[PDB]
């Protein structure tokens, strides 16, 4: 898929702002942002972490204005 | 009033399964982590398992892991314990307990309990007792021996002799059958004039036996 010119104008620019909250375990309804206390398995074989002790990746999929050949290109991040 | 009501204890053969239940009222069940704690007869308390407010996270004592499964249904305000591959030593009063707040930190204490439900793990089959006389203040009695399961009741003279009676709590034998003693202290005078019969009742074997005690 070959890449051609950047549309110019004042209708050619868009900005996306948001927060991604962390997903650490939330082991109870007062501990958003914390995990369950670490428990260590006595062996490798018996290693069995519960979900509320396992931090996970945060992800957000943000809809942008519709374009129909034209795609939104991400340029700068803060 | 916070209340927890247990259900489902009984006798079970070793290797077989059993499922205890606990019904909660008077708090937001879905906001508390929940535990089971057990206590073998005449022994101390041992923590068994904990489950998260959500139902999604369980932890277990080393002593029970792989053979017990704690679970919950928040819609029914119900806590459950599933006993599998059971052992004679798993015999005990099992209590459901609300976690005191410190689930998240690994700091378990128990601010509300239930009655406890007895789980008795025995291979021995239901059996009525043999009653033998303990013949002679002097002292008379009956030996209620080789019965299963608990309990028996013991009266004297069909409820008429009450004073001075001591029915001892049972004992488990090598055999896996219980043996019990009931005695009464009596004036030595009366040992000729007066008859002593112990009424021994074992509803599990569908038994009533009357036995006369005399010198």
From Swiss-Prot, chain A:
Changing residue 42 to H: In strain: Isolate MAD11-BR. It is found in: Virion; Host nucleus. Homomultimer; disulfide-linked. The virus capsid is composed of 72 icosahedral units, each one composed of five disulfide-linked copies of VP1. Interacts with minor capsid proteins VP2 and VP3. Interacts with host 5HT2AR. Belongs to the polyomaviruses coat protein VP1 family. Forms an icosahedral capsid with a T=7 symmetry and a 40 nm diameter. The capsid is composed of 72 pentamers linked to each other by disulfide bonds and associated with VP2 or VP3 proteins. Interacts with a N-linked glycoprotein containing terminal alpha(2-6)-linked sialic acids on the cell surface to provide virion attachment to target cell. The serotonergic receptor 5HT2AR also acts as a cellular receptor for JCV on human glial cells. Once attached, the virions enter predominantly by a ligand-inducible clathrin-dependent pathway and traffic to the ER. The intrinsically disordered C-terminal arm interacts with neighboring pentamers. The unstructured nature of this region allows to make different interactions depending on the structural context: pentamers present at the 12 icosahedral fivefold axes bind five pentamers, whereas pentamers present at the 60 icosahedral six-fold axes interact with six pentamers. This is Major capsid protein VP1. It comes from JC polyomavirus (JCPyV). The chain holds residues 25 to 109 of 354 of the full protein.
């Amino acid at each position: 898929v070959e890449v051609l010119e950047v549309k110019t104008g004042v209708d050619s620019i868009t900005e996306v702002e948001c927060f991604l909250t962390p997903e650490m375990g939330d082991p109870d309804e007062h501990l958003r942002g914390f995990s369950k206390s670490i428990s260590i398995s006595d062996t490798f074989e018996s290693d069995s972490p519960n979900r509320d002790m396992l931090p996970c990746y945060s992800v957000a999929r943000i809809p942008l204005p519709n374009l129909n050949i034209l795609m939104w290109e991400a340029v700068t991040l803060k | 009033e916070v209340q927890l009501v247990e259900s489902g204890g009984g006798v079970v053969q070793p290797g077989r399964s059993l499922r205890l239940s606990c019904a909660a009222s008077g708090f937001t069940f879905s906001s508390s982590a929940m535990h089971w704690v057990r206590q073998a007869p005449g022994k101390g308390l041992e923590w068994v398992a904990v489950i998260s407010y959500d139902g999604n996270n369980q932890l277990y004592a080393d002593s029970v892991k792989g053979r017990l499964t704690i679970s919950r249904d928040n819609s029914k305000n119900a806590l459950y314990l599933q006993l599998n591959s059971l052992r004679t030593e798993d015999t005990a009063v099992y209590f459901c307990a609300r976690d005191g707040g410190g689930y998240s930190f690994g700091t378990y204490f128990f601010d509300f309990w239930g009655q406890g439900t007895l789980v008795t793990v025995s291979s021995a089959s239901t059996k009525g007792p043999s009653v033998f006389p303990l013949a002679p203040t002097a002292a008379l009695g009956c030996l209620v021996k080789d019965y299963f399961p608990e309990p028996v009741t013991v009266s004297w003279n069909s409820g008429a002799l009450t004073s001075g009676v001591h029915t001892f709590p049972a004992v488990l034998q090598s055999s896996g059958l219980y043996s019990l003693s009931s005695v009464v202290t009596v004036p030595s005078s009366s040992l000729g004039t007066q008859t002593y019969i112990c009424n021994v009742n074992h509803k599990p074997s569908n038994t009533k036996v009357d036995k006369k005690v005399e010198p």
